Symmetry: D2
Subunit: 84 residues, 4 copies
């Protein structure tokens, strides 16, 4: 096992760019802790991210798109809450 983050994004909305960006922000700072970050096309304004099935971000629910710093923290807390 190892954590697997998945970013689901609306293709037509043209959110691949940012999906790919956030995927690299993660794989950069957590290159040794993550098993894999997946990019998953979707439709109708979908933009959701989860870690091992746990939602750590969702467009309408969190007000838009995450700051790299925030998503990092939420992935951090998800893996080891007490790891700086």
């Amino acid at each position: 096992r190892k954590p697997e983050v998945i970013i689901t994004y609306c293709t037509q909305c043209q959110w691949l760019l940012r999906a790919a960006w956030l995927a690299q922000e993660l794989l950069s700072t957590f290159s040794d802790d993550l098993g894999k970050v997946s990019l998953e096309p979707a439709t109708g304004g979908a933009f959701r991210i989860t870690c091992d099935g746990v939602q750590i971000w969702e467009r309408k629910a969190d007000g838009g798109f995450p700051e790299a710093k925030v998503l990092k923290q939420r992935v951090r807390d998800q893996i080891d809450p007490e790891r700086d």
Copy 2:
């Protein structure tokens, strides 16, 4: 149900950049046909790409890193052979 691709890459070699680029190339061309494209951290200068377990590229096997068009043709023949690019 849709086919998935996995680009396993050596992080220390600093190949995330490539892996990401190729994942994006693939996703913009097969947005309606790819289940998902994964970026997988690894080591020892590994750079292998799978399309549902089936290898379509392996650094030492194909002499380096694939080209945009070539990887597209491979994924294509794999999922949609009758499709033109």
Copy 3:
């Protein structure tokens, strides 16, 4: 003599990823009007974007980093005011 957009970014801060991301977003939706988008490494902790010398974003001033939505907008006002 088309408009230039430069994004000055702090390299040690590992902000190249977001600078290249925002670059691509601009080149994406303004592919036919921008002469080019430049990425300029700054030795200091900066992140400011100018359009033909006119600053359109500054980390400290504008509160952080911009959302693609906002940036696209400010650049729109700066060059082609009549767009959606």
Copy 4:
């Protein structure tokens, strides 16, 4: 006093921003404090020509396609003025 700048001209409708942006990052993540800037210049007619202070270090036609990371990194390195 005037650090070298790289320009990557690419055909837009060919959908080459990606491979041009990718290369741009490849250079900046390797030559952070050695390059003044790396510019992405939209173009047409399947053009792809990279310059380093005017000095073309690659052009799709002449060079036969698109550069490797290794290569362009080496051709940019060969221009740093020691």
